[PDB]
Amino acid sequence: GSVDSTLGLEIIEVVEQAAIASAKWMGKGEKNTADQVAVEAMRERMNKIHMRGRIVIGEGERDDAPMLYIGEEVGICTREDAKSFCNPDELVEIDIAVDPCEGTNLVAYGQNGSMAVLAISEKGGLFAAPDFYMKKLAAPPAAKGHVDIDKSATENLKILSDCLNRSIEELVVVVMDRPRHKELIQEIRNAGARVRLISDGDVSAAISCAFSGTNIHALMGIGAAPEGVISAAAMRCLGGHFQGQLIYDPEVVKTGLIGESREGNLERLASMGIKNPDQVYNCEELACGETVLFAACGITPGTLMEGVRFFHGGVRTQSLVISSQSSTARFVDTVHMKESPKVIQLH
Amino acid sequence: GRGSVDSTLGLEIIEVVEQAAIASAKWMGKGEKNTADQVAVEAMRERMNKIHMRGRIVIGEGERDDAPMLYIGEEVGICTREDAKSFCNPDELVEIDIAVDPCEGTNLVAYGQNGSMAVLAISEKGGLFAAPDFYMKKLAAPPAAKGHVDIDKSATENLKILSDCLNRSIEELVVVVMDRPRHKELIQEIRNAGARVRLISDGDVSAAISCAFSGTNIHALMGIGAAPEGVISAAAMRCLGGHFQGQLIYDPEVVKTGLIGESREGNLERLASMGIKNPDQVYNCEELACGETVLFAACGITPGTLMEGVRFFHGGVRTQSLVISSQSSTARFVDTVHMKESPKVIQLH
Amino acid sequence: GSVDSTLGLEIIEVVEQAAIASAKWMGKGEKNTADQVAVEAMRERMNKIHMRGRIVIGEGERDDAPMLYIGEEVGICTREDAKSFCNPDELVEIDIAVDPCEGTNLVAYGQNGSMAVLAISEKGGLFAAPDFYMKKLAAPPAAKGHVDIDKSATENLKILSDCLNRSIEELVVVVMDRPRHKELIQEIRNAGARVRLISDGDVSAAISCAFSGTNIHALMGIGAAPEGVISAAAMRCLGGHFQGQLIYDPEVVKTGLIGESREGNLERLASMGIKNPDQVYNCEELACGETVLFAACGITPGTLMEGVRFFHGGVRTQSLVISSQSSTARFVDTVHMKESPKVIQLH
Amino acid sequence: SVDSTLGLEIIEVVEQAAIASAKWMGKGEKNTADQVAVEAMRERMNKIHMRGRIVIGEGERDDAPMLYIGEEVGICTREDAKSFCNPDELVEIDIAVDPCEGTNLVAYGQNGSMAVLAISEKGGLFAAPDFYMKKLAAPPAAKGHVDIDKSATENLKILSDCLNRSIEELVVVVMDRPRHKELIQEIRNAGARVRLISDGDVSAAISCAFSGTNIHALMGIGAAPEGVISAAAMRCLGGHFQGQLIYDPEVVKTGLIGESREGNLERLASMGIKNPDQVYNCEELACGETVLFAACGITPGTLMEGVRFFHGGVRTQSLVISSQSSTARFVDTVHMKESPKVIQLH
Ligand SMILES: Nc1ncnc2c1ncn2[C@@H]1O[C@H](COP(=O)(O)O)[C@@H](O)[C@H]1O
Ligand SMILES: Nc1ncnc2c1ncn2[C@@H]1O[C@H](COP(=O)(O)O)[C@@H](O)[C@H]1O
Ligand SMILES: Nc1ncnc2c1ncn2[C@@H]1O[C@H](COP(=O)(O)O)[C@@H](O)[C@H]1O
Ligand SMILES: Nc1ncnc2c1ncn2[C@@H]1O[C@H](COP(=O)(O)O)[C@@H](O)[C@H]1O
Ligand SMILES: O=P(O)(O)OC[C@H]1O[C@](O)(COP(=O)(O)O)[C@@H](O)[C@@H]1O
Ligand SMILES: O=P(O)(O)OC[C@H]1O[C@](O)(COP(=O)(O)O)[C@@H](O)[C@@H]1O
Ligand SMILES: O=P(O)(O)OC[C@H]1O[C@](O)(COP(=O)(O)O)[C@@H](O)[C@@H]1O
Ligand SMILES: O=P(O)(O)OC[C@H]1O[C@](O)(COP(=O)(O)O)[C@@H](O)[C@@H]1O
Ligand SMILES: [Cl-]
Ligand SMILES: [Cl-]
Ligand SMILES: [Cl-]
Ligand SMILES: [Cl-]
Ligand SMILES: [Cl-]
Ligand SMILES: [Cl-]
Ligand SMILES: [Mg+2]
Ligand SMILES: [Mg+2]
Ligand SMILES: [Mg+2]
Ligand SMILES: [Mg+2]
Ligand SMILES: [Mg+2]
Ligand SMILES: [Mg+2]
Ligand SMILES: [Mg+2]
Ligand SMILES: [Mg+2]
Ligand SMILES: [Mg+2]
Ligand SMILES: [Mg+2]
Ligand SMILES: [Mg+2]
Ligand SMILES: [Mg+2]
């Protein structure tokens, strides 16, 4: 069969529950608990779906991460005892990329920009990125294919200028506040563009480029690779620009392991089946399948989505769900009515 | 042992109301209220027939052999096939009753006017009052007022009660009433009592449900509208904890159905025949939508209080829907950008 | 001595108080009462401003309309000893077009699209429209000068399609629901556009054209002339397209005059010194002053502005105020705190 | 009496300051972001027919060139004022300014920064010294019921009852500072959620006043002048706001080389502050008969969206509050600079 049309809706509840869980730890100074409860909620809700999924991006390798590890099977239809209950569409093998708590320290500190997020494609349709750093360029649909990761920041800004029909001074670039980004940040400033420095969470940033209204027009710089794939899934559905390139030279940025060399990482990467380490991937290559689904729900408030709010009588969440199948981008504002609220606010 | 209504149905109905709304919206302002109606009907039906469910229409366009589509009794959904046990699971095979109003405010759509929507409600078999095509006196009010106002009380007394419940003056209340001659005295009374009023030319489903949300600046619906619209309204209010009561009105002196030589005595016979023992009965919304599970879904056609209208732009379409489920206990606003042809610009809002 | 910059701000309170007054009559079935209280409030509030105004568009002639009649002086600096208490900027002579309750029957019925509105310019800067009908064409800035009131609805729709970069099916035209538009409406329908038929209030209709987000892209057809001028004032500041042409032929439309004749109407027109009755005006002609101010506040809810809301402890209004002097379009969301409210809503 | 018109004119003051400062969003120059805002605000203020004295601002005349303590601002401070200013324009007023609140938020392009000011008749605003101030901000529903002298734990219980929601349904803003370690731990232990901010507690304080911000209290120590400016908004809104000067280096340090508790007290006495430990009421920090408050977002925040630059213009969002007209005004302004062919409704 083919990826069940219905899955594109069902993931709403996946990211919603994971975000609600993690959001209870907002500002409580426990990034690992914030992460853990989101992992658990996401895993529980996924296992209630009639699907046949494999984690290809997640919390770690099988023996580092107990839940949502790479290779893990999730979905009612992965159980031999239950397979008989699944229809042919539900039995289609799909690959899943999860990030139950994007911005664990954002949550721990109660700062903006965190979310519970996942992407899905049929088997093989999502790049199973290693836990390496990744050089990224995200930009809006109007700049897609025009800007390019190999060009300088200065040139890309000029191109964005022409594509978005506005001055460089009327552009905003998001860059992670990291020592690895000093020269880059300086270059963008000298070119005339405004900047947002973020402490964490460059999935939100990348995707914010797609929507006129966010006052964010590009993401430049190095973040984490698994995150990049998840971002690219959103951007491929939205027609947004997203390119990535693995960084493995510890001179540029370091993972922190006591290794710790370009040769060593090159060795690990080769043995992971990555033939060209310096390869540039466009958005269609990082998320390559025939069907791509993406779901995010805000934990703390952010550019695309409101944060989780707890009030007398319930919870309110905001999610963004994108499906290449229905070709839709849905914002879902959910009032979770917990104990018969006497007042229900419109917004 | 039974299946339970599939949790996934509460999300799939999003696409049902969206596709219906979109179709109808193409006819906004074209002065064809039947066309605007028919395309909505067809699109809602098609989208339902792709769902793994076993539905029976109990509120719809008319009787079989009269209405061609979504007639009373019509079977909808894939699990309605004879082969179904082979292709559907126990949750999906649960018999469900469905109330539809694919185009509520058909004339609003024809004139390009506010307040029309594609709407539907669901429950287990027998879980929705299969209302006849008669008029219904209604009282809708917000959750804070539930059980405190009452449909048999005068408008004057309900307003005082609302005033206490919503902690504001009668001058700070807004009541919706259909602009109809049958409401001359009622409107006069609301005016005398000091409340402000919104008169509507059509579409009292939106009016009733607007009462449930703070921010609509609508606090009650009073008066008489169509009965089936009342049930669909009640389904939503039951899930939200809102107040909704209804009472069949079958008296031509009060309101006429357009029947020839229509009479109260005539109307009762027709009502008796349908197994309606007490024509003067007052139902609250738990009785109008009494099933174990209740789902409600709406999508704006033209703009209104709760939902933006359908918008067509270069590269796609944008819809807003309200979907409510007693099962997940949720109220969902769904803002969907339908990307039809690779839009170079996508607006956040 | 030039129009006081500050007047651009003060007119916020003018429309606010007028709209609040009228709003108390929402749904009350009295369209003259709703009108009269807006008139009085707008006048009272104008008479507290240090300005020197003359009404050129208003409620009627002296010895007929009691308030805001043609020629009425309004403002503190119209007084005999004004040079004593008013500065030179405040003593500049300004002409003022008022429509204190635009959509009197909308208010009476509690229906959408009514507002309190006024426009201001130096003396001579606003066309003193007679009380005749006016054929109008409004469209967005990107269409300015490309569409034309003398072209057919069909031709204009084509031009709009090109200017707004969308199909005719993706266009929405507002036309007043009137027998006189039977044919115009049929043509728009045949051309493939969607339509909003309004029962009253073509001021809101015209200006909605100027703002992306309203899903309204043109106003076509005949309305009242003074309303047109006030519309043009706003459109000239926004760079929107607005043309108008007086209509005085009874076969086309009737002002309800007894034994009304076209030729009889021409006499009245000539009498006011209108040389060419068939003249087409663009908005720069209808609002030709060096300085143009416009202010509007929603009475009932509408496309551009939320209506007046009364709640426990206050009132909430939304206004739109535009100035060619400061070159600004301001949306003003005001919470009027009446009773030390215990709860203040963000929105 | 204070001119009714001033309550509107201050819209342009904060808008212009904000716009100038926003040009430096993320450029890494907190002092530039600061300077340009200071200049635009001063320049705009000097076009107003008012008789203003700065009681809170950039520093002493010797230290700070613009908007220094004591500076006269406004057309009606001119020697010829009687001849071209009416009596209301000639009323002496005091002014607290903070042209760029969150200089570093701007430099990093981070949320929470604003151009802000408050105004009262002469004597109407506490001319705070540049010392620290313990603060408690809360919504109108809690005004008088919470108290700054109670523990965070007590206040949270009181908040819960006043706001009719559980402590877990509360969110408390606290500045991310070593001085707040215990404070934060206590709030966490009581079960409330927390938003930690790197800077910008003016926004934090005032967000408690509006339902919909999902912020319910500010607790902790920030800068005192910012506190007065906050009090002015809260006094007009019916919000709870208390402050108390903190002047012991043991608690928090100002960086004075010979900074000592006794050192700071002598400084306080000199300024005419009789009781350094006095707990100030909202009505006492902004005690004038008439209070005005104006703010405009620089970067985005809880109450006000940031300055946006686009093709053909600029968009700002301001909050302007007046005890005189008893209004809270959100002002969303499209600044049309180059005849924009496209104008967004929002
Ligand atoms: N042409 C425009 N007219 C008015 N406001 C605009 C315009 N373009 C952008 N804005 C404002 O700036 C925000 C961000 O725009 P953008 O940088 O295109 O994402 C929008 O949501 C509007 O508030
Ligand atoms: N306490 C309040 N403070 C400020 N605005 C309010 C308040 N209550 C209601 N409003 C405004 O009035 C609208 C309608 O409120 P409601 O009539 O209660 O549905 C709200 O969406 C707000 O814009
Ligand atoms: N490119 C777009 N992407 C998503 N939604 C849009 C787009 N253009 C218009 N819309 C929606 O349609 C509304 C009206 O657009 P317009 O007809 O240009 O006034 C907007 O406020 C959006 O809700
Ligand atoms: N009773 C309610 N019903 C629905 N949503 C709510 C309710 N109360 C709060 N919210 C949401 O939470 C936000 C912040 O509320 P609060 O914490 O009271 O400021 C609101 O703007 C809504 O999005
Ligand atoms: O912090 P680093 O090592 O520079 O990596 C940045 C990555 O971390 C993130 O900020 C996520 O943080 P968490 O792992 O704490 O959730 C991503 O957004 C980004 O890809
Ligand atoms: O117009 P009537 O005969 O008074 O009936 C009112 C009913 O019609 C409606 O306005 C909808 O009318 P449509 O059938 O034209 O869609 C309902 O909202 C309302 O209940
Ligand atoms: O109803 P008519 O005679 O066609 O006049 C149309 C004019 O009336 C208006 O609807 C205003 O109506 P009101 O005079 O009742 O305020 C204007 O918007 C429009 O220009
Ligand atoms: O940074 P400190 O010394 O803890 O002081 C906090 C004060 O600084 C502010 O964050 C403003 O910072 P800036 O001085 O950079 O504008 C205020 O919000 C707060 O009152
Ligand atoms: Cl990494
Ligand atoms: Cl790089
Ligand atoms: Cl790409
Ligand atoms: Cl309320
Ligand atoms: Cl005379
Ligand atoms: Cl900072
Ligand atoms: Mg994680
Ligand atoms: Mg992450
Ligand atoms: Mg990290
Ligand atoms: Mg129908
Ligand atoms: Mg209907
Ligand atoms: Mg009807
Ligand atoms: Mg009038
Ligand atoms: Mg009018
Ligand atoms: Mg009329
Ligand atoms: Mg400053
Ligand atoms: Mg500061
Ligand atoms: Mg600081």
mmCIF file of C-alpha atoms and ligand atoms in Angstrom, chain C residues 99 101-104 203 224 227, ligand 22:
data_model
loop_
_atom_site.group_PDB
_atom_site.id
_atom_site.type_symbol
_atom_site.label_atom_id
_atom_site.label_comp_id
_atom_site.label_asym_id
_atom_site.label_seq_id
_atom_site.Cartn_x
_atom_site.Cartn_y
_atom_site.Cartn_z
ATOM 1 C CA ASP C 99 -19.698 60.996 8.531
ATOM 2 C CA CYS C 101 -22.358 57.323 11.699
ATOM 3 C CA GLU C 102 -21.656 55.683 8.372
ATOM 4 C CA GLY C 103 -24.117 52.812 8.098
ATOM 5 C CA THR C 104 -26.934 54.035 10.342
ATOM 6 C CA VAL C 203 -16.645 53.534 2.853
ATOM 7 C CA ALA C 224 -23.233 58.308 -2.101
ATOM 8 C CA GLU C 227 -18.860 59.026 1.357
HETATM 9 MG MG MG E 22 -22.833 57.176 5.396
#
